[PDB]
Ligand binder design. Structure first.
Ligand SMILES: Cc1ccc(N2C[C@H]3C[C@@H]2CN3C)cc1C(=O)N[C@H](C)c1cc(-c2cnn(C)c2)nc2ccccc12
Ligand SMILES: [Cl-]
Ligand SMILES: [Cl-]
Ligand SMILES: [Cl-]
Ligand SMILES: [Zn+2]
Ligand SMILES: [Zn+2]
Ligand SMILES: [Zn+2]
Ligand SMILES: [Zn+2]
Ligand SMILES: [Zn+2]
Ligand SMILES: [Zn+2]
Length: 310
């Protein structure tokens, strides 16, 4: 026999006692240790005193599960533990003061998102996301990367899009105060203004230039071509995205950007960040230059309050 702590959040610990004749699944259900499925494994002598993750099987664990993860998905823990088994083996080197990831298991899009998150202002709603976010900014990013995969319904090795990953993460963050007011001017229909809140207010797909979005872009109208432009923007940042194309990044005019080279889906991401000079972070590799020209698909800008002059 061995005394054992079970948990769903690694906060509230529930004392249990097991007999070593029965595997952990026979007494706790699906059980995990440091990301390893110890369900069909009988208790060992070193397993005494440790804390294990268990699938919620009573109401107390279900409530503690939601309050920490903000999900009731019964598959979340398993997917989370399965990713952590890989992410805990990745290397997370410090590059230019930022925590990056050495290349492994097609994680280039995860490293780019990780580096981007360390340069924009985000408050995550699930306490599990926020705690791992803090630990990741301090260098321990294995649990944060595993949570990103689980929250995005992606597995280790799967090909990932950075813009889609940031969008899913934005939906789990507090962006209620974010507001975008647009105005569409059609030659026949007239003018009409709409207001966007939340995640829809901080992302645009179509162009990389924040200035071009302020000056207006061409969109088709219901009557078959109108023009939309940005009237007001209330957000700590904006994300401008477009299909990969050659683009010149000027120092001091942007926060960071996503470079994408190669074919659709199976390409490779690099991260460009604007400090005292332009830096390029490719996993564990770092290069710098005063100017940059390359295939860019995401650009991030700082913002607070903006009102047009039209
Ligand atoms: C690396 C990766 C992993 C997965 C996926 N997937 C897309 C769909 C299916 C799967 C998952 N998602 C549900 C895509 C890419 C990818 O390649 N991302 C680059 C930036 C890219 C984006 C676009 C684009 C995006 N939105 N729009 C109108 C266009 N076009 C591209 C065209 C050529 C080359 C790169 C392009
Ligand atoms: Cl929620
Ligand atoms: Cl691995
Ligand atoms: Cl949430
Ligand atoms: Zn929530
Ligand atoms: Zn692996
Ligand atoms: Zn890659
Ligand atoms: Zn979710
Ligand atoms: Zn109309
Ligand atoms: Zn019209």
């Amino acid at each position: 026999t061995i005394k054992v702590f079970t948990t769903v959040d690694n906060i509230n610990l529930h004392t249990q006692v097991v007999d070593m004749s029965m595997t952990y699944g026979q007494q706790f259900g699906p059980t995990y240790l440091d990301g390893a499925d110890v369900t069909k494994i009988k208790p060992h002598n070193s397993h005494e005193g440790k804390t294990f993750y268990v699938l919620p099987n009573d109401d107390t664990l279900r409530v503690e599960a939601f309050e920490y993860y903000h999900t009731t998905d019964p598959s979340f823990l398993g997917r989370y533990m399965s990713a952590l088994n890989h992410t805990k083996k990745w290397k997370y080197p410090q590059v230019n003061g930022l925590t990056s990831i050495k290349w492994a298991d097609n994680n280039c899009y995860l490293a780019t998102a990780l580096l981007t998150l360390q340069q924009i202002e985000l408050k995550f709603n699930p306490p599990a996301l926020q705690d791992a976010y803090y630990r990741a900014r301090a260098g321990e990013a294995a649990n944060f990367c595993a949570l990103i995969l689980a929250y995005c319904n992606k597995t280790v090795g799967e090909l990932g899009d950075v813009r889609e990953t940031m969008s899913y993460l934005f939906q789990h963050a507090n962006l209620d105060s974010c507001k975008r007011v647009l105005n569409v001017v059609c030659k026949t229909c007239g003018q009409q203004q709409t207001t966007l809140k939340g995640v829809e207010a901080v992302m645009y797909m179509g162009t990389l230039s924040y200035e071009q979005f302020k000056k207006g872009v061409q969109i088709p109208c219901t009557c078959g071509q109108a023009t939309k432009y940005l009237v007001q923007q209330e957000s700590p940042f904006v994300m401008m995205s477009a299909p990969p194309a050659q683009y010149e990044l000027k120092h001091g005019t942007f926060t960071c950007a996503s470079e994408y080279t190669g074919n659709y889906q199976c390409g490779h991401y690099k991260h460009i960040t604007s400090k005292e000079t332009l830096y390029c972070i490719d996993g564990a590799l770092l290069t710098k230059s005063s100017e940059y020209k390359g295939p860019i698909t995401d650009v991030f800008y700082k913002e607070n309050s903006y009102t047009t002059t039209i």
